[PDB]
Amino acid sequence: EEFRPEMLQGKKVIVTGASKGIGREMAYHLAKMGAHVVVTARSKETLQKVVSHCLELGAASAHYIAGTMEDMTFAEQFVAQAGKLMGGLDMLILNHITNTSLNLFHDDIHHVRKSMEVNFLSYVVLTVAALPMLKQSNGSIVVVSSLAGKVAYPMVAAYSASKFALDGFFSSIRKEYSVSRVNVSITLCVLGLIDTETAMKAVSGIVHMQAAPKEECALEIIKGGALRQEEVYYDSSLW
Amino acid sequence: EEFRPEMLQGKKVIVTGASKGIGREMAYHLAKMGAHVVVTARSKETLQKVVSHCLELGAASAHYIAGTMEDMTFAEQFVAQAGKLMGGLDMLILNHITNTSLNLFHDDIHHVRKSMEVNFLSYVVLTVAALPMLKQSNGSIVVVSSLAGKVAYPMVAAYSASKFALDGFFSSIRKEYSVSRVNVSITLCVLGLIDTETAMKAVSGIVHMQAAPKEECALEIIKGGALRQEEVYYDSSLWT
Numbered sequence: 061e062e063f064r065p066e067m068l069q070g071k072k073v074i075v076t077g078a079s080k081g082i083g084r085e086m087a088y089h090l091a092k093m094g095a096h097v098v099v100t101a102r103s104k105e106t107l108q109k110v111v112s113h114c115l116e117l118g119a120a121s122a123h124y125i126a127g128t129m130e131d132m133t134f135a136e137q138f139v140a141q142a143g144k145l146m147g148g149l150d151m152l153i154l155n156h157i158t159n160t161s162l163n164l165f166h167d168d169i170h171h172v173r174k175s176m177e178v179n180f181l182s183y184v185v186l187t188v189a190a191l192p193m194l195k196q197s198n199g200s201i202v203v204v205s206s207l208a209g210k211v212a213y214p215m216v217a218a219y220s221a222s223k224f225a226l227d228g229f230f231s232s233i234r235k236e237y238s239v240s241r242v243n244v245s246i247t248l249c250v251l252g253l254i255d256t257e258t259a260m261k262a263v264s265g266i267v268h269m270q271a272a273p274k275e276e277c278a279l280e281i282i283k284g285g286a287l288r289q290e291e292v293y294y295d296s297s298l299w
Numbered sequence: 300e301e302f303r304p305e306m307l308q309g310k311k312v313i314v315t316g317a318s319k320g321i322g323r324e325m326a327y328h329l330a331k332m333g334a335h336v337v338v339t340a341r342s343k344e345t346l347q348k349v350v351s352h353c354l355e356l357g358a359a360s361a362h363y364i365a366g367t368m369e370d371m372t373f374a375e376q377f378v379a380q381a382g383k384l385m386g387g388l389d390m391l392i393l394n395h396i397t398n399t400s401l402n403l404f405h406d407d408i409h410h411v412r413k414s415m416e417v418n419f420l421s422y423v424v425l426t427v428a429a430l431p432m433l434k435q436s437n438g439s440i441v442v443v444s445s446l447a448g449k450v451a452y453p454m455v456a457a458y459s460a461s462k463f464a465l466d467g468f469f470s471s472i473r474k475e476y477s478v479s480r481v482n483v484s485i486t487l488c489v490l491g492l493i494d495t496e497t498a499m500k501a502v503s504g505i506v507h508m509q510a511a512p513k514e515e516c517a518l519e520i521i522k523g524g525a526l527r528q529e530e531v532y533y534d535s536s537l538w539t
């Protein structure tokens with residue numbers, strides 16, 4: 061089965077970490093495909109500009125809700141609102157991560173914990189909230205992970221710990237979904253370096269892997285989830 | 300080259316989740332090799348019985364401290380008290396896990412969180428507490444993981460997630476330590492099914508893998524840590 065931009069046409073999609081970076085690109089991509097979108101992040105400010113340009117790009121719905129994925133109660137409640145706003149859910153793109161930077165690990169448990177809460181725990185919380193709505197549509201769950209979630213790299217240990225956990229968790233749930241009756245697919249994205257603002261600043265003179273375009277990456281994620289692909293790897297050509 | 304039971308002789312070792320199972324087996328092995336051991340777990344009474352049989356087995360020191368790795372403060376203070384008792388640390392064997400059982404995941408976020416806290420966070424917290432003592436001894440860290448910490452399996456999703464995190468974190472810290480000046484080794488153990496009491500009860504009649512012996516396991520872990528092996532795989536002869 062080939063991808064067709066129409067596969068997204070009209071679908072009800074949720075995109076977290078959408079105020080910037082790859083998250084925003086997907087929201088615009090989803091708008092250009094005429095989908096319903098609910099974007100979330102902390103920047104109330106930036107989200108509104110993203111919603112508006114989403115309408116201009118052709119989104120069917122284009123709403124936003126702001127709040128921190130540090131608060132599990134928000135993540136839970138947000139999926140309810142987003143489902144109410146759209147009257148259902150087809151696809152849940154889990155993409156937000158707490159800010160991290162390249163640093164040797166010394167004793168920053170605080171970062172290790174916050175990283176695990178925002179990068180891993182909240183995804184499960186959002187997944188638990190979205191599962192019923194997703195079951196009613198035979199929908200899709202999209203987990204945006206990193207190449208550091210498959211291979212441990214120095215200077216990103218805590219972040220790496222969180223992106224592994226997603227692998228362990230969502231890769232098992234996928235197996236349970238199989239012998240259960242759950243028709244919700246789970247696409248895990250293993251991205252290399254992507255030329256987003258925050259990323260490129262963070263790696264500035266440390267190590268160059270030839271980042272790949274955030275526009276093309278954002279689509280390649282959307283493409284995989286549409287095709288119910290088990291996982292997606294963006295520019296392995298660069299590995 | 301080969302392991303020699305003396306390599307642990309006199310060494311000051313910590314074993315968590317040592318109140319039973321593979322954790323207890325490691326403490327007894329360590330005493331038989333005549334090392335100093337400080338075991339921790341929640342079971343005050345059971346721990347006392349383990350220290351006693353360790354003295355009998357020939358351990359040099361053989362003490363205990365009781366408490367739950369749910370309280371991050373305890374873990375932090377535990378390594379402090381444990382280092383005073385032995386006057387240093389040579390090897391830190393992280394072995395405890397929160398109770399888990401075969402269950403499809405539905406909405407037990409509570410278990411996901413407790414699993415990450417006990418099976419993963421406390422290990423970092425303990426690792427942080429011991430690094431000075433371990434640097435001062437060019438020591439070793441042993442993280443006891445599962446075949447589920449490398450392959451996703453149904454019914455163990457929360458547990459599996461926690462064991463993946465251990466790999467990602469310690470596998471980087473190992474590489475970080477490589478380019479820093481840190482001579483502390485990190486041994487990751489990927490065990491298959493091991494015939495401990497709780498595991499066999501928890502898997503009974505559901506899963507049919509060839510259980511492997513806890514005595515040989517507990518040793519095969521220690522051998523790995525003694526030789527500063529990056530990781531150890533126990534009875535891979537049972538899976539393929």
Ligand SMILES: NC(=O)c1ccc[n+]([C@@H]2O[C@H](COP(=O)([O-])OP(=O)(O)OC[C@H]3O[C@@H](n4cnc5c(N)ncnc54)[C@H](OP(=O)(O)O)[C@@H]3O)[C@@H](O)[C@H]2O)c1
Nearest residue numbers: 077079080081082101102103129155206253254256258259
């Ligand atoms: N960029 C890469 O090279 C790369 C490589 C591999 C994997 N990835 C993965 O790709 C995803 C995004 O990459 P990126 O370049 O887009 O990062 P990014 O540009 O910094 O985007 C971060 C997003 O996450 C949100 N966010 C941060 N903290 C949040 C919090 N407490 N609560 C809610 N939202 C929060 C941000 O919104 P607010 O600031 O408004 O809170 C922001 O929209 C991530 O899942 C990453 O793991 C990226």
Ligand SMILES: NC(=O)c1ccc[n+]([C@@H]2O[C@H](COP(=O)([O-])OP(=O)(O)OC[C@H]3O[C@@H](n4cnc5c(N)ncnc54)[C@H](OP(=O)(O)O)[C@@H]3O)[C@@H](O)[C@H]2O)c1
Nearest residue numbers: 316318319320321340341342367368394445490493495498
């Ligand atoms: N058993 C297997 O087949 C298998 C396979 C792969 C990997 N592993 C790993 O091998 C390690 C031990 O395996 P096992 O079968 O021997 O487990 P076990 O027999 O049940 O031993 C559990 C130990 O962990 C401690 N424990 C439980 N909750 C604790 C808590 N909140 N705080 C502190 N300690 C706690 C117990 O002491 P208290 O009850 O007194 O608290 C107990 O001494 C584990 O790290 C496991 O992940 C095991």
Ligand SMILES: C1CCc2nnc([C@]34C[C@H]5C[C@H](C[C@H](C5)C3)C4)n2CC1
Nearest residue numbers: 206207208213252253258259262269
């Ligand atoms: C900001 C944090 C977001 C992020 N997610 N993955 C990465 C990578 C870190 C390094 C270098 C490169 C490939 C791989 C190992 C994954 C990019 N980053 C870095 C940018």
Ligand SMILES: C1CCc2nnc([C@]34C[C@H]5C[C@H](C[C@H](C5)C3)C4)n2CC1
Nearest residue numbers: 445446447452491492498501506508
């Ligand atoms: C009780 C908790 C201890 C534990 N850790 N990993 C396992 C395994 C679960 C299943 C069957 C077998 C191989 C692999 C998949 C890992 C053992 N267990 C047994 C269950």
